[PDB]
């Protein structure tokens, strides 16, 4: 979408994941979806070292809304849990230097059965503006036929544009065609700043693992759309919660740097480890994710359960991910011919290799002849950089 | 088998899942299947607590063997890997206050393709005696047929005894058993000490859910049969390697425990982070799955995707394992009635509720019309133990 923003992924924090639709004030008063949540995360945001790293979206998903829309037919917040509005929540996080993020529905509904945007486009994209949003992520849960999905998802674009306020637009158009017809992903770029592919994330290996096998078996579709101001989403970052041993968060932080992805934390800032925070906020990898050239990267090469992906950079860098999939026994040696990276150009006649992931340490020259031997835990991914010169 | 050994579970260290079948002594020295691996880890079992948390057994499992007989019908230690043989490894495990097990196979080869015991049964378990073994785990790999199959571990139990020696009998019959024929735990019972039921564990998520699963569905089968000189084996700990996050890892250690299950680690003892220790060698889920009466728990409840598994104990106490299987979100409350725990007699009139994990804490008394509130991790588990007193 040609607006000006998300000429790199977009980063920030979104509540989904791991506090889903909580309702339930009285009993779990610290963890509802309401204003105090948000304006809590907000303060962390800044006080943490997040927004300094680049997390700037502080996003409210589902369940924000009250069940009836008001006698102008607006959408409005929850009179308990968002007693003094979306405005002011707002205000607070633009006082922090900071974005607001929220969510609605092209449909009926949104998914979890709230009042959805269908018939309200100009109403709600005009709500949103004069609130002070500055993303919307827009959901395709009971939308009847898909021609009223696609018209949707236009429509909406054109009403947040003619608001005159720069809003990202994050869209889940193409997951929702997936059953009935091939997306065409000239078309949403052209409305979307990012879309999302593939079934929702949840707390597991198995769900980091089926988003990586979606996306890589359709690579050939999805990975030269991406670019800068439109970017593939395949979903939050469920780093420093309960699902994931420490290596499968460094396999889900490098593949998402790997594949240009929006970087969207959904966690509790107020309890994550000091591990956690550190690799959510690595510079180098983040600076991978970020990189201006904005072309996705894609799976290189599998066998014997070892993946290789690999993503070109600015400055005629790479980057390049080593993914052990075998779930038994120890760290296994892999070997690769650094002259099958990077189209062959990246290390001709020679390139500085530093890996990155797990832990940072410069490796050396290698000429293009030379073999790189790495050492990758299961279920766990050594990410390199390879550069003309340290 | 009343062989007066395992009269509660065998506790120890087993090298399959973490070491695997590493032949490669010139390359991956420090991590082949050789004496020096089994020297070092039998070093650290003392010098590191594990013997005194319980740890006695220092198993070797597949591949120690050469690929041929002796010229006397002898299995033989492999010479580059364990050039001083298997009496010398035995009698330096004894001389450090551990006792060596060691494995075969029932049929014509190894899983890994070695030779198998099949027509040697007596040469082996004398050859076993002989060098100071302590366990025989005895795999059911390369055996036709079934008869073969039970006469094998039959034939075998009988010759182990004919040597006078002490020797613990591990075997695998109903699993190799189960894809043809329901297996008699009876007859199994009579001659075995432990009793694989379910496919390989390996270090992933997946998989301690699937030997959960299979175990509460198949509960009315197999956890009366168990008891003292007789545990059902539901495969090793991976507690401490690289697939599991922190609250699965709790959550293997809690059931294991309800299971009475024996406990073999799998894992390298020289590189294991202290949290992983600490859970290990926790006294009292320990002092639980070595209870004097040893008799098996079970899953008590299901349903919302939580699980409510219970054990009982020596002096009228029990122990309660609560699994919340939900991936995604956050902690989850699970309030129950200590009425229906212990088949209404745990907490009658009143019980002394102590939570062991995640953390320890006392929860004070409740009387029998109380109930009990609970905040589960997903994938986590909280362990209590109810008493008579604190
Ligand atoms: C090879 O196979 C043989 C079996 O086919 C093994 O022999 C068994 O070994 C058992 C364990 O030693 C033994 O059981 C014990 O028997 C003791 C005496 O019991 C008789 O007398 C009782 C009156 O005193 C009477 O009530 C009983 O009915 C018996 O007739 C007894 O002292 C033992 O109890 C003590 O130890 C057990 C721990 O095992 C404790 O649970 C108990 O609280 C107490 O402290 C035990 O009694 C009971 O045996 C039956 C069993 O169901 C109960 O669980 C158990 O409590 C058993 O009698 C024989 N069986 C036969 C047929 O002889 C043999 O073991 C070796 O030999 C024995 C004698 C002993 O020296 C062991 O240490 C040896 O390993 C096997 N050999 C090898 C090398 O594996
Ligand atoms: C509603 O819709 C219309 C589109 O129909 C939006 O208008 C478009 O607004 C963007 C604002 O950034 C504008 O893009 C710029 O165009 C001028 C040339 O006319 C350039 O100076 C800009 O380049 C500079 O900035 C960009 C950062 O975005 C950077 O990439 C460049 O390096 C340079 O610093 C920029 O040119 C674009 O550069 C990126 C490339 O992919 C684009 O093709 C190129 O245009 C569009 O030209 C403008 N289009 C039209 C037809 O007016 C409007 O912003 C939107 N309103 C709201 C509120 O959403
Ligand atoms: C997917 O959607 C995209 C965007 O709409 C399609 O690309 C567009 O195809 C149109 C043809 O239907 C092009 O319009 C033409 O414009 C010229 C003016 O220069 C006219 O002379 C001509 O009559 C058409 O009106 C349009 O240029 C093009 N847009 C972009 C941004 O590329 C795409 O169509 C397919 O890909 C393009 C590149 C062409 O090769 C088409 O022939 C081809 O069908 C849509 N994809 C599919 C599979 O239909
Ligand atoms: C499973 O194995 C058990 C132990 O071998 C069998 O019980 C034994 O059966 C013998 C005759 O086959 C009999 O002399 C023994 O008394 C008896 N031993 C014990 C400890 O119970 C069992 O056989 C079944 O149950 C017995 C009681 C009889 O009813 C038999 O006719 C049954 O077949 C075996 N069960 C099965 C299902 O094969
Ligand atoms: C969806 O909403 C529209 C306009 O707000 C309304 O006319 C229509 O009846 C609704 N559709 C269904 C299926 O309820
Ligand atoms: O198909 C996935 C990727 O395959 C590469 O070979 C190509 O250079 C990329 O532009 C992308 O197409
Ligand atoms: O559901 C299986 C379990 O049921 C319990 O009521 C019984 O006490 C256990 O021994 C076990 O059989
Ligand atoms: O109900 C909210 C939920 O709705 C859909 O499932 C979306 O894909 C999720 O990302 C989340 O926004
Ligand atoms: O090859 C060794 C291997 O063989 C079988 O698969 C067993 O079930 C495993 O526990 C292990 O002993």
Redesign the interface.
Known sequence: LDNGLARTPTMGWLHW????C?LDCQ??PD?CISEKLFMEMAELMVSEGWKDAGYEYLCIDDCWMAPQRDSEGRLQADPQRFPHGIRQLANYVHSKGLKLGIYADVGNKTCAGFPGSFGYYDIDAQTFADWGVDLLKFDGCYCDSLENLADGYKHMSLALNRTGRSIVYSCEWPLYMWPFQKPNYTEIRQYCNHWRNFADI??????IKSILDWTSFNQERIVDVAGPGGWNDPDMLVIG?????W??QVTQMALWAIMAAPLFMSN?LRHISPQAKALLQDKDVIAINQDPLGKQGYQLRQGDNFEVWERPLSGLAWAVAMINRQ????PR?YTIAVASLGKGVACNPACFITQLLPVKRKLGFYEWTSRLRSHI????TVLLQLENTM
């Open positions: 994941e791991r506090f889903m909580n009993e779990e963890s949840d707390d597991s290996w198995k769900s919660n309960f699902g994931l041993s290596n499968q509790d779930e038994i026994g120890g040696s835990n299961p279920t766990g």
